[PDB]
Design a protein around this ligand. Sequence first.
Ligand code: ATP
Ligand code: CL
Length: 420
Amino acid sequence: SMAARVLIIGSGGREHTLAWKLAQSHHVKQVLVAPGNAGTACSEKISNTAISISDHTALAQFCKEKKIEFVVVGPEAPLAAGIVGNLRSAGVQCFGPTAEAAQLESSKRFAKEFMDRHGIPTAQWKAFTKPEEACSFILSADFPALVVKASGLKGVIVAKSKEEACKAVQEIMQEETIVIEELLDGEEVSCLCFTDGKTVAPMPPAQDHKRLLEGDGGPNTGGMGAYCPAPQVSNDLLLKIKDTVLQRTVDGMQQEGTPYTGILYAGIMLTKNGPKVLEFNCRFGDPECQVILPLLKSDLYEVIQSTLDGLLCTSLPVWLENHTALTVVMASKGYPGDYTKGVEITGFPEAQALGLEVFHAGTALKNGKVVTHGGRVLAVTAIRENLISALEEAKKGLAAIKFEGAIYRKDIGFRAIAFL
Ligand SMILES: Nc1ncnc2c1ncn2[C@@H]1O[C@H](COP(=O)(O)OP(=O)(O)OP(=O)(O)O)[C@@H](O)[C@H]1O
Ligand SMILES: [Cl-]
């Protein structure tokens, strides 16, 4: 099925990665990214479009006029806005869950209730709308009830003391419901799968670093780096997770008459008691996408097309084994607070020539130059035989790329390396 045109929604590194990867398919003549960035502007197959992504009527008309085969959604917002359901009733295929099914991410209360209803393991919890009753619960639990979550996508506060959790319940009920749950401990890992509603095809597990500074210090951010596969997870554990979380989530959704299709993301804590779910999401994470998709050997276009057709098992994904992908984000001075914009970037061509992938996040074209246009500017991904080697190879690319006030971490993966 040659000469397909495909559309991706979004404008960060995740969307560059999806575009790059799709463009490799022999089935694909054109990838359009809406609105895209400087990394996707100007390629043999990839280009940007200013089509509105929030007016679903106009988006559908644009899809049919250009004969777009299907739409791929990068970020979570359009999913929760109904993009899939609306494109479908207009006769346009879109990869992703419906708004109803994205409730696994969009409402934390729904997710926790859904999990209790189907014996999916997760931290014990309770929801509140009055803050006084929330304090009562914090103050009188014998387990550490110290994690407070704004139900509607601060958002999440992990307190160390009852005092801090009461303080937190106060801040989140300023500017619905909140969920207070047990503080678990152990290792966090991201477990994704492709799913068509019935079949489940897990991705190899990833980990990322949210903290701004080396050593895991400073403020949290959207993610300063990631790598895949996380060596902390045995094969047994992955099949426990596939059975106990992924297949069980999809089956549960299907059995409640709200089938789940696209990507299911589960954030998981490895406890002494086993795997527990911290949160669901409905799309690739950023910068994890930048380390999972480079590991995919199959044609992504085939995987997606077969997922839309409900024939996921006819085209199971095949992964690169014995390779580790690791990615390191370059960010603008001041991130995650106020940062500078419009700063000229050099060296990303030589970084790629060294055999690395450069995935653009906040970049833009300006007067024949590429300039910073966002907090996270780009990521360099290396694919090698182990973490340590991938890290050091990525760092050569990082040293070639220069912009005024660039920051990045030189220790991505340090814990996985210490685990081994
Ligand atoms: N139920 C849970 N048990 C334990 N950890 C959790 C739970 N749910 C979420 N988390 C994790 O807590 C992490 C964030 O907590 P962290 O220890 O970084 O403190 P923080 O709230 O981020 O503090 P800061 O004010 O510095 O941002 C997230 O990575 C999130 O996945
Ligand atoms: Cl919908």
